[model samples]
Target: QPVIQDQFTYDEPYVQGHVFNNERVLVGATYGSLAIEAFFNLFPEENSGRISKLSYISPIVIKQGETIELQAKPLQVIELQIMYREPSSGLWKPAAIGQCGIGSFEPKKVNIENVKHSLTKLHHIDGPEWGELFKTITHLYRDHKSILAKIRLPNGHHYTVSPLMTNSAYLAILSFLEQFDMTGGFLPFGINDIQFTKQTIKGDCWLLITLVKNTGDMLLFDVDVINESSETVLHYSGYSLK
Candidate 1:
């Protein structure tokens, strides 16, 4: 809860890296679809902003029996990039791109009670409507256990898994906060200084998402993917919110 706001400093400097390429189909059906629906539902008119770039390195395949997990932690913002639109011609322009000193703290755990409250206050969904929405999310996590089971990363790391649940968890949080303007309805402008490392993931992970700072109308957050083993599987900061 400190006022770190939009400043960060790292022991090492930033380096240029290759473009992000993730080739896996994790979510698309009701679960994935609903997550997106809940997110866009919060937008003024479904304008969920835009993402010009993305990058990550994790297990591409979740085999037949390994489990998935996630965790949360305080993270530092190391880099950022922003873009602007040329209103007259509808062209995109760069506003800011480079290392950042912004710092972020962990957010309180998101739960069913708060989720329900946020949903009702923001989307007018309650009773069976809210029940059904959560039901689908639970079902997806249970039903897709096998499809999202743990697997080995190309780097030979054990306890690795796919981003299916991670993505779903994120969507669920977004859906719950759809009506809360301070925490919902922003879109990604771009991501840079993205780094992925060897972090073990297991069943029913704990996810932590934190809002780093806001620049003008944009918000930045750090997402922590932790597992039941209490290990950090993936940590990526610098996700933009517009």
Candidate 2:
């Protein structure tokens, strides 16, 4: 049996408990739809509950060898309006008032100017496919060679490569993420807890990917980007294919 980290409680009543390994995990009760969509995009098998809109406050990054303590407290009731993009015309419009479970809390008025900015940003960020992500990556590698290096794949084997400091380099990480969708997975929801170290790619740049763990649904990888000098330029851990 796998060991659990700790005990916590969620206030949401309609949570679907998913048994990952032997541990019971809550599916949609604690996570937002955007987070679910981005983080678990690599794993298309698990069906996250369909809620048109969700408003969650806490941000969580649960991992092994770590202790997580959570408390269930009532948050202030905030009115949330939603927007959607018209598929035919590609125009964004006010959709509807989103429903939430925060009853018995103070309802505050929505900020119109701030809400518009937030909605516009969300509209632009939510709709890119994996191929588009890949294109962005290649474009970054091509345009920013001064700060970023080209990532190469070997003829038949995956290997180590170099790393660079560029926004395009980070953008290219999403390009690697696109493969999950091409291989029949969903688009990624989000990424978190990302750290960059002093190691810089100074040689032939390739990634050495190793499957660290797999729950038969969500996958984890330990990747290293190194150079021809055999020095590790970038070491990325805690990458999830959910």
Candidate 3:
């Protein structure tokens, strides 16, 4: 619905696939990661800039596990169009559209200083509990423990793994959903952009994921991957979940 629609509106894409699957439906956050990788493949050169924006499009319509091959098309100078193939059709569909920028991108445009968290801390789904809340929702907890981070209760959650393992989008999204106890049935599928100001180095610092807004149909959040020294690391603005 964002204009100049068809995947064909751009050049033919270069395909890339994830050779691994866990015999479960694809997780939305993994979907985001793969889309990022696919678009990066299209411009792997060093001067091609870094990914600055990720805009969610259609929910994945997985129609095999092998043509699991998502493709990317270059747009403008730094934008990428990410598309995935349907096993039943040759048509390439937009998974997520993104943009790349130089340096640390732009952090000046993001501000959560005035945002407040108003959603119930979902007592059922602990603010830091990553186990059951995700088991049936977006993650199949059985085989996904490796890459995903463990969240504990309240929006008071933090990763329970090593002391310094850097956080990924997958972990944050899982952590994002943890605040609102959405366990089963149909849940919204989507995410917002990440314009990194600093790299997430949890080595000597801390991170906080906060909710910005919760519309009936969507939720928006900000992740201030900050340092205890009063310095700020990466600031993720609007990690929208729907």
Candidate 4:
């Protein structure tokens, strides 16, 4: 387990194209929501609104002028492969390759620390105002008090998918990586497993989360979407980030 602390239901879909569209800086994250939707559309019964495990390796760096394309094919009866590629001069260059869960997941419960909370006050800005979250650290969040307040998530780095929500699932993963700082080059490999135990919040709620360091390059995070009373509305096991 070299990825996220844990995972759960998600939103947002970030690919490499956004960089070329508006900014073209080249960066991208719960970013996997698009993949989930793809699976649901192709195989609804097994992957409608949930996922069990996901594995993939994306080593290619999609730069400007290169086209990002995701092609899907059934891997196993319940598993599928979503290939992320770049349409180059002649051949479709391979940028990333991913596996999606098309089967039901086992039910398991995770406990979130009741009293304790993250020092930083994280907020998931809606899609309309989502652009502000990616803004400079100053304008990221209002009156935040977390230790990692300044360091933003790799979400919406590319408005490629622009999915539905503000893409806050990844931000919930701050439970783990907060142990260290990454000021240098950080290459993202891909997510390995993100067992969805429950869904994210709907209108207004807070997230209770736990992060796990699976490996040096992999991290897993679990989230408990709750409200002001501290009752869990949903839960999810997170991702693999390298």
RMSD of each: 17.8, 22.3, 11.6, 9.3
The sequence of per-residue lDDT tens digits that candidate 1 reaches over residues 167-228 is: 44444434434435463243344343223322234345544455566679865556554444
Q: Pairing residues by index, what is the TM-score of model 1?
A: 0.34
lDDT scores of the candidates, listed in order = 0.31, 0.30, 0.41, 0.39
Return the top candidate by lDDT: 3
| Consecutive 10-residue window with the lowest summed lDDT within model 1 | 10-19
TM-score of each candidate? 0.34, 0.28, 0.49, 0.52
- Candidate 4 — which residues are off by over 4 angstroms? 1-31, 45-53, 59-67, 90-167, 172-188, 195-203, 226-235
Instruction: Report clash pairs, candidate 3.
Output: 126-153, 127-153, 127-154, 128-151, 128-152, 128-153, 129-152, 188-242
By lDDT, highest first, what's the ranking?
3, 4, 1, 2
Best by TM-score: 4
Across 124-192, the per-residue lDDT of candidate 2 in tens digits comes to 221222222122222122111111223432111111111122222333444444434445442222222
Looking at model 2, report the run of 10 residues with the lowest lDDT sum: 154-163
Model 2 lDDT, residue 66, Cα: 30
RMSD of 1: 17.8
- Candidate 4's residue-wise lDDT over 1-242, tens digit each? 12111121112223322332243322334235445545555554552234445544443344544544444444553554455544444443333344555345443332323234424343552201224434322112211222222223234222222222223444434323443565432323445544432233334444444555566666555544444454544345554455
Worst 10 residues of 4 by lDDT: 1-10
Q: In model 2, how large is the Cα lDDT of residue 148?
A: 24
